[PDB]
Amino acid sequence: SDLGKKLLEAARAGQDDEVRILMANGADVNAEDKVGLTPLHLAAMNDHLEIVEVLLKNGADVNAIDAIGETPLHLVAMYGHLEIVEVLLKHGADVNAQDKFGKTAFDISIDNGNEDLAEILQKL
């Protein structure tokens, strides 16, 4: 309840140790806020790699979607955090997931003309 909200904020804000202790305390790796974002979404979108890593290690849901169908991958695609992009795919992120406007991570790489990201997306 409160642990869940506390974890969401910590992941969002990048408090590595908060994340760690909260989960040990019993916070749900997969809590969602009102608009459907998880700690994995929040931590990834904000470029917090260690946290992402730790969340996945604790069984965070790589293909969690928020209220408009966005996965963590959608978000890191939009922000261009390539190294987080890789960690997600390494955990079975679904490169094909469609958000609500039927956009995939690759569609985002095209829209924002990020050639590097499309490079790695395409490859996979």
Partner: protein, 137 residues
């Protein structure tokens, strides 16, 4: 008696139309009105109105999840600042190349048109008119 002279502090009622050119070498003072609040998600809008033009400044700090293309519903812009057609205020986030825009519509329920976001520092200073009719969809 009730004429305007080339000296003296004076008050002048009536609709006066100057067909020629007018210069003001001192200050020109019109009524103003200011307002400031958190639109939502930690984003602050500060407004100052002068005539039909509004000077705005985006401020604050994203502190909660804002969905892509979402309405900001913590606070609306009061009607007296609301434009007749939607005004898209282009802002920028600190520390990167990321740009966004906030629509303020006639209803004053502002709408965030950036992508989904949960952190960062939005900024942007400019103006928007109150009564510029967009004229044709």
């Amino acid at each position: 008696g009730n004429v305007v002279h080339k000296t003296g502090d004076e008050t002048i009622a009536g609709k006066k139309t100057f067909t020629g050119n007018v210069e003001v070498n001192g200050s020109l003072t019109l009524p103003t009105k200011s307002w400031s609040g958190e639109l939502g998600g930690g984003i602050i809008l500060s407004l100052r109105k002068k005539g039909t033009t509004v000077e705005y400044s985006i401020g604050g700090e994203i502190s909660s999840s804002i969905l892509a293309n979402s309405n900001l519903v913590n606070r609306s812009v009061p009607n007296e600042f609301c434009p007749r057609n939607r005004c898209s205020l282009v802002g920028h986030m600190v520390g990167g190349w990321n740009a966004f825009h906030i629509d303020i519509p006639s209803s004053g329920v502002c709408q965030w048109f950036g992508p989904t976001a949960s952190s960062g520092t939005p900024r942007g200073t400019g103006t928007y008119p109150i009564d510029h009719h967009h004229h044709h969809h």
